[model samples]
Target: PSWLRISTVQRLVRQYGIHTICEEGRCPNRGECYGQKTATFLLLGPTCTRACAFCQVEKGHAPAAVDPEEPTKIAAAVATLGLRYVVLTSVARDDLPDQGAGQFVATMAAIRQRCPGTEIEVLSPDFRMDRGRLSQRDCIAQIVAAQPACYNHNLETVRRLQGPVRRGATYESSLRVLATVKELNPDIPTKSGLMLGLGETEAEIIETLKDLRRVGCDRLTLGQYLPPSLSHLPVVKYWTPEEFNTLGNIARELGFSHVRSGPLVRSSYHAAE
Candidate 1:
């Protein structure tokens, strides 16, 4: 609707030299997300360690070294932009020993220090590890101890489709990411998302929602999946607005405190509420 805010976002992130997952790249709903005043910041770096078939983020190379001053830089941007809420998402950092968990905590601390009133939500990767100083559980505990406003880990797709869609991740591992957060902090409000139109069944969706509820996941985001490019998976179907509403209603009945389900809904869309 307007370029004023979008340009302002462009200017601020430019000012701080931080990267975000907003329209500057391949987010299909950039206008809606920025219009709603929630900017999803991508930390750790531009390159990802794994190769998920559906993600637009470039991968298969060694990830850049975690920046020491990213917290301060990102904090400055949030403060200057007067962001009501902030969402932190990162490229999967399997290369790092901590899997970029420390960076998450540091950025959170910096934001709180600069803008004490702003609420930050984390959309993190599954911190699976074969050997490290911090196991997946230990890293998640570190993040939860930082006490973000909300902790979100997307399932990405139904269990059957997960294998093909999300490389370097398992359905059970993703569920454990949410469950571990609840295990540590019962009231922190865990959240997850599923991109529809990926050859999933209605029954599979219901079961996925149930699985989330079982893990005490508190928030939900259901969006239609769009392929990043001709190289990625095709959109098998587009759920109608009415269908999204029906699924959202089911999620509400399933007991999610908040649900954002629609064709354009992204994880950070209207995330403040």
Candidate 2:
């Protein structure tokens, strides 16, 4: 039953020639999410400019021009799938002038136009690339103007592991991304995520949570980091389910309005709520 439903989503993605982080990144929760008939759409392009060591998504310095019609085509998929809630993610595009921020708004517009009732969420890379007037906040403001149902920028790992785990991303910048989203529009709920099993200490984990809450992050997802391949960073530990439960409780205590913590959780997992 699960594979059949997942296959339905896979076939649609193939038919529309669109991307989903769930499939592109080989996310473990694809079955759970696709089985529930939900997916996080990946935009801009399949290749990312910033090569995070933990990621399995393809990387390229100069991604080809954004597909002009890909936006509404994904909208067609949303309409065909009858998705009530949708999550949008993209590979980091530092090589692009706007860092591909415009595509996000474009896609959101298409989805809104086609599925007026579908709530759209975005899992974004830090728009830290500044090209003259196109500063990070400027890029962020572009997408925030679209007023996605929720905005997510994952810190990915504790500050100590950030240097090794994520290339072309900084801990401070990721936090600021969430802060900037909240600053632009407080009505839009802010979200962030952390991947454990990257050699993070318990105290470091607690500190990261504190930092997220300080920046007004309203939602959080905690999950164990599994190595994407032999070349990627090794998993330092597999955080037990018991540990995840404890972290979930701590996240709630820290004031996140919504929290999902477990081994299988991803930034966009169960994001509809």
Q: Compose the digit string of candidate 2's lDDT tens values, residues 1-273.
A: 122114788889889999887777777787677766679998987877677888877877677678989898999999998888899988887777888888999999998988888899998888887757489998999999999899999999889888898877899999999999888999999999998888899999999999999999999999878777755688778888889999899999989877999888888998876
Q: TM-score: which candidate is best?
A: 2
| C-alpha lDDT of all candidate models, in order | 0.86, 0.86
The clash tally of candidate 2 reads: 0
TM-score of 1: 0.94
Among residues 3 or more apart in sequence or in different chains, the pairs in candidate 2 whose N, CA or C atoms overlap within 3 Å are none
**What is the TM-score (0 to 1) of candidate 2?**
0.95
My TM-score estimates for the predictions, one after another, are 0.94, 0.95
Q: Worst ten-residue run, lDDT, model 2?
A: 1-10
Model 1 residue 46 CA deviation in Å: 0.8
Clashes of 1: 0
**Model 1 lDDT per residue over 1-273, tens place:** 121115888888878778897744556666566666679999997777787887776665677877898899999998888887999988888778898998999999999999989999999989886484579998899889988899999998989998779867998999999999999989898999999998999999999999989999999999888777654677888788889999999999999977999887888888888
Error of 2 at 15 (Å): 0.8
